[PDB]
Amino acid sequence: XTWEXWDXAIAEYAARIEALIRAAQEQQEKNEXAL
């Protein structure tokens, strides 16, 4: 109920990180277009 706040913050950074990694990977497979 802070721990379920904590577990909120973690899952909603986790979602942001997953989106960034996915975007960077789908940039990387353009970089390897450039190559």
Partner: protein, 198 residues
């Protein structure tokens, strides 16, 4: 979306991973106050080193942010291969500092788990293996990035190193991915301990 833009995304990943990590640190300190009595057994040093690497990574992130703005300001000059390579060095250093923090949080979770739970049940034996595996994988990616970095710094002087730069983007990205798995393993461990003892 171009190397500079992808660099922006790596940096944002790193920053978001550092906020996630600081949340794990908070979890661990809550557990530590229930389970342990003072800074014996390495804990005073743990606290000090959490603080020292946190301050170092804050400072590396601030430097990477300034290099990022500089690279973005100069996109039309064409010329900054060296700005891109510099930002690769910055991101690698941040990743390495993050990895020291992660290893400290892993050590903390292990020390606390050993006092309250058998190592042999509840997913803990798989946890131990996965921790070991990803730690090895991350170290290998960091070593490969360091080697690629030295090589890229050489090629830039000569004919060119565009290929080396794209390869280094891949290295850093994979390191960040692997660190996200480690972070998720540390979150799991903290939740098991919290369910047990809080």
């Amino acid at each position: 979306s171009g190397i500079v833009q992808q660099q922006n995304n790596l940096l944002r990943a790193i920053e978001a991973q550092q906020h996630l990590l600081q949340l794990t640190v908070w979890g661990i300190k809550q557990l530590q106050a229930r389970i342990l009595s003072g800074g014996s057994g390495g804990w005073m040093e743990w606290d000090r080193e959490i603080n020292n690497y946190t301050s170092l990574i804050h400072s590396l992130i601030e430097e990477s942010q300034n290099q990022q703005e500089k690279n973005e300001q100069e996109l039309l000059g064409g010329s900054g291969g060296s700005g891109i390579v510099q930002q690769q060095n910055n991101l690698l250093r941040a990743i390495e500092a993050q990895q020291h923090l992660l290893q400290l949080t892993v050590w903390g979770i292990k020390q606390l788990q050993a006092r309250i739970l058998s190592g042999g049940s509840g997913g803990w034996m798989e946890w131990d293996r996965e921790i070991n595996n990803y730690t090895s994988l991350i170290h290998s990616l960091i070593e490969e990035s360091q080697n690629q970095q030295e090589k890229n710094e050489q090629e830039l002087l000569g004919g060119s190193g565009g290929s080396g730069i794209v390869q280094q983007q891949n290295n850093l990205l994979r390191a960040i991915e692997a660190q996200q798995h480690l972070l998720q393993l540390t979150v799991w461990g903290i939740k098991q301990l919290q369910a047990r003892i809080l």
